[PDB]
Amino acid sequence: TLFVALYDYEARTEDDLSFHKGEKFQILNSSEGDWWEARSLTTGQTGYIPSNYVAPV
Ligand code: NA
């Protein structure tokens, strides 16, 4: 189950990940809260993303 970005997002710190609308992710840890550790299938970068900015594909 893959996820896609709904809006652009600029990370505030090194811990979150910036991304563009339409970018897709594999989710690495969702059980930690509403911010999920994810990997971009476009760039390969990794970081936390807000789960309310993605939807399942
Ligand atoms: Na969502």
Swiss-Prot record:
Species = Homo sapiens (Human)
What the record says about family reads: Belongs to the protein kinase superfamily. Tyr protein kinase family. SRC subfamily.
Whole-protein residues included: 85 to 141 of 537
Q: Could you state what the record's PTM comment says about this protein?
A: Phosphorylated at tyrosine residues, which can be enhanced by NTN1.
Query: What is the name of this protein?
Result: Tyrosine-protein kinase Fyn
Compartments in which it is found = Cytoplasm; Nucleus; Cell membrane; Perikaryon
Tissue expression from the record? Isoform 1 is highly expressed in the brain. Isoform 2 is expressed in cells of hemopoietic lineages, especially T-lymphocytes.
The SH3 domain is annotated at 1-57
Q: How does it assemble?
A: Interacts (via its SH3 domain) with PIK3R1 and PRMT8. Interacts with FYB1, PAG1, and SH2D1A. Interacts with CD79A (tyrosine-phosphorylated form); the interaction increases FYN activity. Interacts (via SH2 domain) with CSF1R (tyrosine phosphorylated). Interacts with TOM1L1 (phosphorylated form). Interacts with KDR (tyrosine phosphorylated). Interacts (via SH3 domain) with KLHL2 (via N-terminus). Interacts with SH2D1A and SLAMF1. Interacts with ITCH; the interaction phosphorylates ITCH and negatively regulates its activity. Interacts with FASLG. Interacts with RUNX3. Interacts with KIT.
Q: What function does the entry list? A: Non-receptor tyrosine-protein kinase that plays a role in many biological processes including regulation of cell growth and survival, cell adhesion, integrin-mediated signaling, cytoskeletal remodeling, cell motility, immune response and axon guidance. Inactive FYN is phosphorylated on its C-terminal tail within the catalytic domain. Following activation by PKA, the protein subsequently associates with PTK2/FAK1, allowing PTK2/FAK1 phosphorylation, activation and targeting to focal adhesions.
